[PDB]
């Protein structure tokens, strides 16, 4: 437009809810409903207690998750673009951006915890979703992994952003597309962590 005086600003990403990984049953926990994101997302102020390491988050179009690792909520740019979060102090700026990685990060809102950079070097992994659902993962490459049942796009979609973790717990990447054929997802492709790392 050229008028600027009318031109409208983003909102922030909000967190929604999270992944509750702490006892032994994963299960989703919603935080705040679709209203109060709304409100939350036009004045970047959230006051709402973070707990966990996987976050729900959303835009006013989208939901997808965000993961902390070493002290960064970690999450994809073609969920978040250049957005701020919303923080109990007001939006706070990505600190990380890196669109050639499909991936922003964030200071980690008080209250989170972060995983650990894996450094075991095994290739057996686990993928959670939005929906809580742990699927295992073979690793393939420094960047893919197949899953040993195969699910429809669908079980998958609004999960870039989730964590692949190793047998320990800790994190080996983050979620960021399917590989997909005729709908079905045989693979999944991630940043790695130690690519988190060299953009740290
Ligand atoms: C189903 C869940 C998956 C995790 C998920 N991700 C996606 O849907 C991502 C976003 C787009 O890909 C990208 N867009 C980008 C956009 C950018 O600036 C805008 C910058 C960099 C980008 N880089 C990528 C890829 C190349 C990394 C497309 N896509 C794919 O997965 C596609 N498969 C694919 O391309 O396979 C390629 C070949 C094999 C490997 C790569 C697919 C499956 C056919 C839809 C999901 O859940 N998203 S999401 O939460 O629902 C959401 C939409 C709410 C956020
Ligand atoms: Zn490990």
Redesign the pocket.
Same mark, same amino acid.
């Not at 994809?76 to 969920?79: A, I, K, M, P």
């Not at 998958?156 to 952003?161: A, F, H, M, P």
């Not at 979620?175 to 997909?180: D, H, P, S």
């Given at each position: 437009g050229s008028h600027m005086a009318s031109m409208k600003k983003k909102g922030s990403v909000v967190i929604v809810g999270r992944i509750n990984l702490s006892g032994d049953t994963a299960y989703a926990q919603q935080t705040r409903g679709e209203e109060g994101c709304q409100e939350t997302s036009q004045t970047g102020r959230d006051k709402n207690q973070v707990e966990g390491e996987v976050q729900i988050v959303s835009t006013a179009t989208?939901? &997808?998750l965000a993961t902390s690792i070493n002290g960064v909520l970690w999450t *994809?740019?073609? +969920?978040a +673009?250049t957005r701020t979060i919303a923080s109990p102090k007001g939006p706070v700026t990505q600190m990380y951006t890196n *669109?050639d990685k499909?991936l922003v990060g964030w200071q980690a809102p008080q209250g989170s915890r972060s995983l650990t950079p894996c450094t075991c070097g095994s290739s057996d992994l686990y993928l959670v979703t939005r929906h809580a659902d742990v699927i295992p993962v073979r690793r393939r490459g420094d960047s893919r992994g197949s899953l040993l049942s195969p699910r429809p796009?669908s079980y998958?979609? +609004?999960?870039? +952003?989730g964590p692949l973790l190793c047998p320990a717990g800790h994190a080996v990447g983050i &979620?960021? /597309? /399917?590989?997909?054929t005729r709908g079905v /997802?045989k693979a999944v492709?991630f940043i790695p962590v130690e690519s988190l790392e060299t953009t740290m």
């Open positions: 989208q939901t &997808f *994809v740019y073609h +969920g +673009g *669109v499909d796009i998958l979609k +609004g999960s870039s +952003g &979620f960021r /597309a /399917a590989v997909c /997802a492709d």
